[PDB]
Amino acid sequence: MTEPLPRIQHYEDLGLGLFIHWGLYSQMAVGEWTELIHHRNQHDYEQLIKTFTAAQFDAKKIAHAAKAVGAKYIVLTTKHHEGFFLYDTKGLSDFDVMHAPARRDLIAEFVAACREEDLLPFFYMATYDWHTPLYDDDFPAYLTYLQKSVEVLCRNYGPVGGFWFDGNWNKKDADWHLPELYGMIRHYQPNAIIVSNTGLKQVSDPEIDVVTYERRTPDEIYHGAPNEKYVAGEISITLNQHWGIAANDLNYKSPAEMIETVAHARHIGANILVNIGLTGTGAIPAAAQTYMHLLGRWTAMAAPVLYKGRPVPVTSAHGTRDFVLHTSKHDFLCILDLQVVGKDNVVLGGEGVNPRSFVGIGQPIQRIHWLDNDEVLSFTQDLDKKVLTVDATGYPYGSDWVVRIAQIDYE
Amino acid sequence: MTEPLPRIQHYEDLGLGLFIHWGLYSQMAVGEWTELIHHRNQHDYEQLIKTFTAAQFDAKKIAHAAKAVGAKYIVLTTKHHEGFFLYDTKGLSDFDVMHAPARRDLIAEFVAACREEDLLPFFYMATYDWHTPLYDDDFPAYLTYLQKSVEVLCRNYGPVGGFWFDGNWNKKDADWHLPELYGMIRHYQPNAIIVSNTGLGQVSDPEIDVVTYERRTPDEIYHGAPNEKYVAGEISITLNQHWGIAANDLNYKSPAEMIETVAHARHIGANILVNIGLTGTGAIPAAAQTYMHLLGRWTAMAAPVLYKGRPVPVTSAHGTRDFVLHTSKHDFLCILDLQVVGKDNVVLGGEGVNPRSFVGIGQPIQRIHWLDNDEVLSFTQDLDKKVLTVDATGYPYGSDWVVRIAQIDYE
Amino acid sequence: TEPLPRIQHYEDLGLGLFIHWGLYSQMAVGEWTELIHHRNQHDYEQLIKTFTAAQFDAKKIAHAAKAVGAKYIVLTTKHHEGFFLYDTKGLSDFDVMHAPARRDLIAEFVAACREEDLLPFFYMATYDWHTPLYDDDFPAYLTYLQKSVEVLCRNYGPVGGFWFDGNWNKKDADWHLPELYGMIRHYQPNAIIVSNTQVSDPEIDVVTYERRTPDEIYHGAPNEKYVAGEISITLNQHWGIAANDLNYKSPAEMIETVAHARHIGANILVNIGLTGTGAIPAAAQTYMHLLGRWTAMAAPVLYKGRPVPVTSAHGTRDFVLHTSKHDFLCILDLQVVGKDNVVLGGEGVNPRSFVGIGQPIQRIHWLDNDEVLSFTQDLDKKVLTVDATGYPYGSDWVVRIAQIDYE
Amino acid sequence: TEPLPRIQHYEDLGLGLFIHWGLYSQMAVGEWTELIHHRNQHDYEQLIKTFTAAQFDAKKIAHAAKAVGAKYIVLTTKHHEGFFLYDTKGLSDFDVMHAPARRDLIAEFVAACREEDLLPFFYMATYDWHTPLYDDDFPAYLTYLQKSVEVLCRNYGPVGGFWFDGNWNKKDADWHLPELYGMIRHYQPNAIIVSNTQVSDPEIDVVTYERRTPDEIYHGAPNEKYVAGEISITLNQHWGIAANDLNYKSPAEMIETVAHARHIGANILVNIGLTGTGAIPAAAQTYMHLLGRWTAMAAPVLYKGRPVPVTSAHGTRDFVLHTSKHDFLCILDLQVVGKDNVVLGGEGVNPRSFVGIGQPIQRIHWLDNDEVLSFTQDLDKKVLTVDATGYPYGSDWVVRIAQIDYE
Numbered sequence A: 001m002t003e004p005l006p007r008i009q010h011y012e013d014l015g016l017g018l019f020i021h022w023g024l025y026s027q028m029a030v031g032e033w034t035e036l037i038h039h040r041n042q043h044d045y046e047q048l049i050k051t052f053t054a055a056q057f058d059a060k061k062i063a064h065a066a067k068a069v070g071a072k073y074i075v076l077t078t079k080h081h082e083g084f085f086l087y088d089t090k091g092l093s094d095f096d097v098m099h100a101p102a103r104r105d106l107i108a109e110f111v112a113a114c115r116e117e118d119l120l121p122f123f124y125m126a127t128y129d130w131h132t133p134l135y136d137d138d139f140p141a142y143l144t145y146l147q148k149s150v151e152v153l154c155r156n157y158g159p160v161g162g163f164w165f166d167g168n169w170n171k172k173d174a175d176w177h178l179p180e181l182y183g184m185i186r187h188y189q190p191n192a193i194i195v196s197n198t199g200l201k202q203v204s205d206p207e208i209d210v211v212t213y214e215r216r217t218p219d220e221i222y223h224g225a226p227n228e229k230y231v232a233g234e235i236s237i238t239l240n241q242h243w244g245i246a247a248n249d250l251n252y253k254s255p256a257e258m259i260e261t262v263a264h265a266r267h268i269g270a271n272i273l274v275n276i277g278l279t280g281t282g283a284i285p286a287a288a289q290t291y292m293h294l295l296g297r298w299t300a301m302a303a304p305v306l307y308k309g310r311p312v313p314v315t316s317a318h319g320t321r322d323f324v325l326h327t328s329k330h331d332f333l334c335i336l337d338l339q340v341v342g343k344d345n346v347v348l349g350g351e352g353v354n355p356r357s358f359v360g361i362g363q364p365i366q367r368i369h370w371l372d373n374d375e376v377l378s379f380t381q382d383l384d385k386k387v388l389t390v391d392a393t394g395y396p397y398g399s400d401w402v403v404r405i406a407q408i409d410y411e
Numbered sequence B: 001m002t003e004p005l006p007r008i009q010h011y012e013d014l015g016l017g018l019f020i021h022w023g024l025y026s027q028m029a030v031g032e033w034t035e036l037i038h039h040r041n042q043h044d045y046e047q048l049i050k051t052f053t054a055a056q057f058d059a060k061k062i063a064h065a066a067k068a069v070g071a072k073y074i075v076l077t078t079k080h081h082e083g084f085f086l087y088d089t090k091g092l093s094d095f096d097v098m099h100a101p102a103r104r105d106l107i108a109e110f111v112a113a114c115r116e117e118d119l120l121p122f123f124y125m126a127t128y129d130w131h132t133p134l135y136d137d138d139f140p141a142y143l144t145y146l147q148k149s150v151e152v153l154c155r156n157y158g159p160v161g162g163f164w165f166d167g168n169w170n171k172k173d174a175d176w177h178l179p180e181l182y183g184m185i186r187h188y189q190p191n192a193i194i195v196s197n198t199g200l201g202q203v204s205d206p207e208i209d210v211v212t213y214e215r216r217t218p219d220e221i222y223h224g225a226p227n228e229k230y231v232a233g234e235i236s237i238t239l240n241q242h243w244g245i246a247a248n249d250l251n252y253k254s255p256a257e258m259i260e261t262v263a264h265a266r267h268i269g270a271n272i273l274v275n276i277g278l279t280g281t282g283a284i285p286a287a288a289q290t291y292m293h294l295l296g297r298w299t300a301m302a303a304p305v306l307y308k309g310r311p312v313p314v315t316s317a318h319g320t321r322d323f324v325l326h327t328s329k330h331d332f333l334c335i336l337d338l339q340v341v342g343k344d345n346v347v348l349g350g351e352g353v354n355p356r357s358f359v360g361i362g363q364p365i366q367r368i369h370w371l372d373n374d375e376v377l378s379f380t381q382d383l384d385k386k387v388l389t390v391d392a393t394g395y396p397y398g399s400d401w402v403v404r405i406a407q408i409d410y411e
Numbered sequence C, D: 001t002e003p004l005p006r007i008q009h010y011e012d013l014g015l016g017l018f019i020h021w022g023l024y025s026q027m028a029v030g031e032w033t034e035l036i037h038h039r040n041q042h043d044y045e046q047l048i049k050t051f052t053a054a055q056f057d058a059k060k061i062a063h064a065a066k067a068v069g070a071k072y073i074v075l076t077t078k079h080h081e082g083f084f085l086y087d088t089k090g091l092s093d094f095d096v097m098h099a100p101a102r103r104d105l106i107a108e109f110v111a112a113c114r115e116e117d118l119l120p121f122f123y124m125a126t127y128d129w130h131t132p133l134y135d136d137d138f139p140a141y142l143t144y145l146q147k148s149v150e151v152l153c154r155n156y157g158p159v160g161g162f163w164f165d166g167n168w169n170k171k172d173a174d175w176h177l178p179e180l181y182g183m184i185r186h187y188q189p190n191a192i193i194v195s196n197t198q199v200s201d202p203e204i205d206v207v208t209y210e211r212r213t214p215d216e217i218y219h220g221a222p223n224e225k226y227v228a229g230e231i232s233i234t235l236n237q238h239w240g241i242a243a244n245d246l247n248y249k250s251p252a253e254m255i256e257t258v259a260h261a262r263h264i265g266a267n268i269l270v271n272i273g274l275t276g277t278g279a280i281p282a283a284a285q286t287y288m289h290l291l292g293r294w295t296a297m298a299a300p301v302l303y304k305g306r307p308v309p310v311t312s313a314h315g316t317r318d319f320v321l322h323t324s325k326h327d328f329l330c331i332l333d334l335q336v337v338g339k340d341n342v343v344l345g346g347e348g349v350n351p352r353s354f355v356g357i358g359q360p361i362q363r364i365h366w367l368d369n370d371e372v373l374s375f376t377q378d379l380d381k382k383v384l385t386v387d388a389t390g391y392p393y394g395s396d397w398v399v400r401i402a403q404i405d406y407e
């Protein structure tokens, strides 16, 4: 029924963002929850402020890399559960980057770098806080502190792409005074996108614009009750098991799974964040760079559909995971489980005719071609039953796109 | 029945090797079979010799990286199907590195680098050759050329760890004169390990030491007919779908699958080779470096068992993929499918007691501990039925080893 | 909360037989045939003229239920087609008293159940294709539905329960459940009320669940009435008889589903569709006999066994049931034991572990043959490991059950 | 090489019934009971005294085979236990003439087969637990085995075939197959010789395969004799009757296995184990009735259909069979079609594709109900795509078959 507000339409066009976890935890490289889960002495853990130099943090390099990977926004942790702030809190707290050797407002560097690359800057903010005794001792006063921290971000950095709130789930029963928090954001940042990790329950507040979901969600996501405000959706993937850097977490997902995940998000009508954890001093680690390079080659190829493509009621035949995305000028077949083509005696698996069918395309087609190399595909249609069948040829030897995309040109 | 001859015994102790594909094909970055598969004009393809500078080939860097990853040998392509030689063929052919701008014997650099790191140098040699017309026109004379090219390798580089022969499968019916070829190797290099891609029912020549197998072979490999020479086994994994570099092959396996495959080779009684394809100019590509760093962290942890551990008739309980490796002083439980441990309300999957059982351990045990952190495991035994059950605790937050290894200390 | 007595008794029933029989049975193309095959209503309703019930024997049905180890039977008293298998005493002419059968089949059924010590349950469809009231005057339909249930509550003596199906057809409507269930409580205070569709009315006693539900079912909010649960399985794809539906489940899957219901804390109904004239088909008998062999073996745990917070090791589907005197290990994926050269899969030691048993054990034995199992315990971590020996050649129970005797 | 006439005839049989019946049947714990349960030989062999065959009716068995669509029957004439179901004419006292039955059961069987136009096949175990010759004087055992086969070749008229099982017990021994098979060829030149486990002797006509074999079977080296193939399925885990083996396969799996045999170019035997006294058990009758409905529907292709190099699209298990007049699409994983708001899974258009059909098609229709299917072709790439409509409510064939009529 209702259609997205302009700022939410713009959000859905972003498609892909980079999530960045960086805090004091990064110096230990054993996960962002280390303070709580490893039962550390608070006083000793908080001494990490003294070695927070940010000596290798280069916001320009990060924004350039985000642009190259095809991301259109970046979510940076401005304050995680540990409660340390990566920006100048202007007197709210001494546990911030201005009281660290770094002495730079990192958020200011980040916002300027994003603007130069035409990326939207988003601010992650943890609402469950392990630093301030207010959280357990005086929750109402905690709410004021949380709100003021958000307000500083709202008033000192120019227009903000969005806020990414995490952690109300810690006290599911409490009154978090969302009307006041969100209202303040609307007042200073009317165009900001408000994302919530615990947006659902029916949404947790009318001002929420986006709700997060499990990456494995099978079907098109929920957009709100009819006649209510349309709410977008977003999924997240981290490269291993942890969000902050974790040196001895070897359990990385394949680049292939990462590409399939990104494609999948688009298929169910969501944005996707791909997460990297910076080193203690703020560098992109070499492993993350590898994943970004590979994803970048895919998103460059997929550019005609990744941003504007939307789910459409077109299904694939029995036993395939193929799907279709719609833009106003074209449909795109996203085709999975292809193999590489050999020659003569050398059989790699992609060589035979490979009919892939779809149900729901009722218009006559002029031409279909692979985005990666412009090869024209042969096809048949039954317009009455709305059946399309293409011969989905395998990859040219030497290449393998994991999710291959064919563009349909209508008559 | 028979046991390995000493060179073979030493070979099985190597455990892990690095496979390196580098040739003229590397300059195109569309796979090592590009000349045949892409139906290239030979003269045009072979012009790549003129730009083969090897400007970024540093054998010391490669040997260092192999050492860091825990490899004990390196197999370098000395001549692939394209038929170009990476060494000085001393007049046998003009299609060699001495006729390229590089003007350096790359095999000589490689052998010196290996020796300084205590790695065995192995020479891959393609027996199916696309360059010399002898191959199709005058097979007997081809055999002489092949043999002479191996003789140069046998006589000019000091003691060689081994030869890795690939391509007799191209003419399954021909007489390859293996006794003469292998006999010549035994003359000059008595201690060299001879590996064959299609060396297997019956082995293709008595002089073969190692035969290759698919990585997914489920059970302990075949060692030869009972009264006959024991032959070792080896599996291979490439990181994507290609052996030479392939810039638009995004279909990389996960680091986790790589670790599981290394453990699996050891479990079935084989060595494992992890393949990297160099850039046109001979650099290790950034993606391969990422995989090497991850594997290196695992093999450093697994060092007590990776080299000397051998299969043993001890099975795991129903529904697990766990297995056991034996050394003279210890058994090691290799345990898969573990999760990370959270704390209190924060549940990551690994926190409950996790009984993993094995059948075939008959001796009383004194202590069991994880290699990664020395945590002591609780266990129970039934000595009559030869049952061991351990509580396989999950990973400490911030880490995940994919295959976790517990050392058993017997009473 | 603790379940009301009648609900405790319900959970002890364990297994029931579901019986689908109506005019649809004469065509043997599924119970929804009238709607799904778009039949002419007038022509379909003529099936009343050939409804003889010539082979319906309520005593044979009760016998079959007893033999299979069922403790109750749910009979379709009126399905969506809207034909009543009992005397509606003037409410409708579309009932068995206007059919050639001329027998109140519900009265036969109730008597047959009581003689075998089974509880009789009445299925009633609330979505009705026969009366124009359903679409054209919903409030008056509610009165008709309620009256049809009132007859069942007032003409047969004490009744085991009612099984309501079809409120799902109008999810938004006011079904006036307080009045319907209030009337039931008035005449039948002890009847179990089951509903196919937070619970929809305080008077509901049991709620249905999909047979594949993975985890222990929901019993109500704390401080509220405890509600039981039930799953259902039909042998092929249809509930009424369907002659050319060859897609029968394996007997093994049937046994696994019965065990699974107990594991999640639910009863289970196994459905049979009678022939046009009311006979149990031969195919259904075969399933019953196989099931009967299993439930006879499982008798010490099938009725009183309850879920307990004891899990099985990684990679097994084994589970535990608790009675007040014993725990029982329900062990899946066993193979048959050969001899020497003949290896059938079950011969090696087969350690199966469980977490959550904290008491020292004296003895463990298979229910099927009394073989004593070896085991080890770690009482601190609450680990039990048994060597689950494979089946004796010539037998295979699908779900094998070991009884634990505590010290 | 083209197959020999008798082998061509064999491949046209398609489906046979396998029947296990011996002394073991009286104990109902599997046909290997004597060896696997380590029984006292003397005590086990006393079962001859209660072998009455009181319920064996060869005419009923032949009728049931005909009804299920089988074209031949393989009967165990002597299993490992070594008891003979026929008159061995002095070769052994451990035969049916020395049992209360006092009837040549093989003679009854052959006559019953002939009246129903079925080929009679004789299973003979070559691994024998009765005669001490087997372990103590193997060469003399071969003479005894050969003589026992000679009786079957000389006293019963033309024999459809022999089904030899058990050379696998001594893989290395010289079984003197030239002499055994040569003797069969002399007396029964037209008999099919089947061997259960390069072929072991030129005279073998059929070789057995695992039922799960994925690809078209091996027919012999080129320039050599063509050898046919056969797979077998038993209903539970045992071949002889086993009362407490509840681990039955689904009827659906049975149908899929029959279709599968044809797909790989093999015949299929479906096994039943008789009761001690020679009756078909009720459970087996249920499976036979279900299979019979499928084979009656599949009759146009079940006998003459042959594999052909036409493959199905990615992600389906569909396949094609060729006769000289038609191709047939065998389509799996279909669902039932509901109506309007009632969704059963089969209602959307369901494009199923095949590669390898190069000729223009006039019409395609389902064998079960004659519904005409819509389709498209790309003749250059040899692609056919059909809309494989789901089952009419009330039916489910498991493997549905569409006949192609070419222009």
Ligand SMILES: C[C@@H]1O[C@@H](Oc2ccc([N+](=O)[O-])cc2)[C@@H](O)[C@H](O)[C@@H]1O
Pocket (backbone or CB within 6 Å): A032, A033, A166, A167, A169, A170, A197, A236, A243, B346
């Ligand atoms: C993007 C992710 O967002 C939250 O994820 C959570 C937060 C809370 C719970 N929780 O309370 O279970 C689980 C995941 C963070 O806690 C996490 O570190 C990461 O930043």
Ligand SMILES: C[C@@H]1O[C@@H](Oc2ccc([N+](=O)[O-])cc2)[C@@H](O)[C@H](O)[C@@H]1O
Pocket (backbone or CB within 6 Å): A346, A347, B032, B033, B166, B169, B197, B236, B243
């Ligand atoms: C390690 C690998 O070894 C061989 O792999 C082959 C060779 C032949 C076939 N073949 O004939 O199918 C397949 C893979 C090489 O061809 C390949 O380039 C690589 O070096």
Ligand SMILES: C[C@@H]1O[C@@H](Oc2ccc([N+](=O)[O-])cc2)[C@@H](O)[C@H](O)[C@@H]1O
Pocket (backbone or CB within 6 Å): C031, C032, C165, C166, C168, C196, C232, C239
């Ligand atoms: C036991 C069964 O009870 C209902 O089954 C249903 C009812 C509703 C749904 N539903 O709403 O999804 C599914 C199955 C009936 O529709 C069916 O005919 C049979 O009697």
Ligand SMILES: C[C@@H]1O[C@@H](Oc2ccc([N+](=O)[O-])cc2)[C@@H](O)[C@H](O)[C@@H]1O
Pocket (backbone or CB within 6 Å): D031, D032, D165, D168, D196, D197, D232, D239
């Ligand atoms: C038809 C069947 O024939 C054999 O089945 C076998 C025999 C040998 C093997 N084998 O050696 O693997 C497998 C099944 C018999 O063992 C069985 O009793 C039955 O009669």
